[PDB]
Amino acid sequence: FWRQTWSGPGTTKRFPETVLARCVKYTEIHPEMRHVDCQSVWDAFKGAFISKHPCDITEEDYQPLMKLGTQTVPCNKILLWSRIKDLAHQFTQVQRDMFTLEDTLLGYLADDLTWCGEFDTSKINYQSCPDWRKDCSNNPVSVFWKTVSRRFAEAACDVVHVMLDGSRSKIFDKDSTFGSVEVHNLQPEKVQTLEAWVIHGGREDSRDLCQDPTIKELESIISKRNIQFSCKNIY
Ligand SMILES: [Ca+2]
Ligand SMILES: [Ca+2]
Ligand SMILES: [Ca+2]
């Protein structure tokens, strides 16, 4: 009758140190980001999520961080953020030729980390954080990715790509970052085509997943934005 915990992993151990070190490294390598004050970046990031219930985070909380992390991207070579992470697999040439969200400062900072705070202190919660499936799908991590990927989609032009997980119960899912935020922020003035690569999980070459009802739903959304749609099965 009284909630005792969140259901998800707590904040990654050493999170503050890790984010700061990543900021220092990225901004020493990238010739256009030398202006960045990594301490200010950390302060803005921490300020987004501390001293609040984790589920109460909103995109607006990340706006100070977004401002500090402003950065141009190569619009015509974007591979959007999706539930396919690792790289698909060993798509070596694709990785060479595509710009992914973790290739930006802000995506690089947060990649492969978990974080949250708590309502009653300004401390980082290392004990547990909301699980997307069990507690709340809009949490400090997922809302961070919604905020950054919104801007990323807005920047895209020409042919934009996304990799979809052909093994998911909803291959295109309106609740994912891609389905809730990115797809709706592709700009028809800039984007010619959205091409979805649907990654198969095996069973040789099974069904044509580009005919899946959820892909038809995606095709409809994109068509209504006056952008071309292309789907390919990647086996
Ligand atoms: Ca909420
Ligand atoms: Ca997805
Ligand atoms: Ca990359």
User: DSSP letters of 11-31?
Assistant: SPTTHHHHHHHHHHHHHHH-T
Separation CA 82–CA 164 (nearest Å) = 7
Task: Note whether 206 and 116 are same-domain residues.
Answer: no
Contact 22, 41 (CB under 8 A): no
Q: For residue 136, how far is its CA from the centre of ligand 1 (angstroms)?
A: 7
Closest CA to 11 of 136, 138, 112, 148: 112
Task: Note whether 8 and 26 are same-domain residues.
Answer: yes
| Distances 235 to 47, 90, 116, 156, 207 between C-alpha atoms, Å | 43, 13, 37, 26, 10
Closest CA to 125 of 27, 49, 33: 49
Q: For residue 182, how far is its CA from the centre of ligand 2 (angstroms)?
A: 10
Closest CA to 73 of 111, 45, 33, 37: 33
Contact 210, 182 (CB under 8 A): no
Which residue, 109, 133, 155, sits at the end of a domain?
Answer: 155
| 75 flagged as catalytic | yes
Task: Note whether 7 and 49 are same-domain residues.
Answer: yes
Separation CA 26–CA 22 (nearest Å) = 6
Catalytic residue, chosen from 136, 157, 210, 231, is 157
Method used to obtain the model = X-ray
**Number of helices followed by number of strands (H, E) in the chain:** 8, 5
Two tokens, residue 115: 């974080």
Separation CA 63–CA 15 (nearest Å) = 20
Q: For residue 189, how far is its CA from the centre of ligand 1 (angstroms)?
A: 32
User: Which domain, by its residues, includes 197?
Assistant: 73-99+156-235
> Could you say which ligand is closest to the alpha carbon of residue 214?
2
The helix-helix angle for 15-29 and 38-49 (nearest 10°) equals 140
Which residue, 137, 155, 173, sits at the end of a domain?
Answer: 155
Task: Note whether 161 and 126 are same-domain residues.
Answer: no
> Could you say which ligand is closest to the alpha carbon of residue 142?
1
Contact 62, 144 (CB under 8 A): yes
3-state secondary structure of 145: helix
Which residue, 108, 137, 155, sits at the end of a domain?
Answer: 155
Strands 128-129 and 191-199: unpaired
Closest CA to 148 of 68, 54, 226: 68
Q: The CATH number of the domain where 234 resides is what?
A: 3.40.50.720
> Could you say which ligand is closest to the alpha carbon of residue 56?
1
Separation CA 87–CA 97 (nearest Å) = 12
| 157 flagged as catalytic | yes
Contact 45, 105 (CB under 8 A): no
Q: For residue 104, how far is its CA from the centre of ligand 3 (angstroms)?
A: 9
> Could you say which ligand is closest to the alpha carbon of residue 73?
3
Task: Note whether 57 and 127 are same-domain residues.
Answer: yes
Q: The CATH number of the domain where 28 resides is what?
A: 1.20.82.10
Two tokens, residue 106: 């802000």
Element of type H or E holding 229: strand 228-234
φ, ψ at 166 (rounded to 5°): -65, -10
* Tally of domains within the chain: 2
What's the CA angle centered on 116, arms 172 and 105, to 5 degrees? 70
Catalytic residue, chosen from 23, 38, 55, 75, is 75
Element of type H or E holding 196: strand 191-199
Spell out which residues have Cβ within 5 A of ligand 1, the ion: 55, 138
Task: Note whether 122 and 209 are same-domain residues.
Answer: no
Contact 192, 226 (CB under 8 A): no
Q: For residue 152, how far is its CA from the centre of ligand 3 (angstroms)?
A: 13
Task: Note whether 201 and 229 are same-domain residues.
Answer: yes
Task: Note whether 41 and 60 are same-domain residues.
Answer: yes
Task: Note whether 142 and 162 are same-domain residues.
Answer: no
Task: Note whether 217 and 233 are same-domain residues.
Answer: yes
Closest CA to 213 of 171, 184, 176, 175: 171
Q: What is the resolution of this structure in A?
A: 1.5
Contact 189, 147 (CB under 8 A): no
Task: Note whether 80 and 107 are same-domain residues.
Answer: no
Task: Note whether 104 and 141 are same-domain residues.
Answer: yes
Strand partners of residue 231:
196
3-state secondary structure of 215: helix
Dihedral, CA of residue 166, residue 170, residue 174 and residue 178, to nearest 10: -20
Q: For residue 103, how far is its CA from the centre of ligand 3 (angstroms)?
A: 5
Q: For residue 33, how far is its CA from the centre of ligand 2 (angstroms)?
A: 29
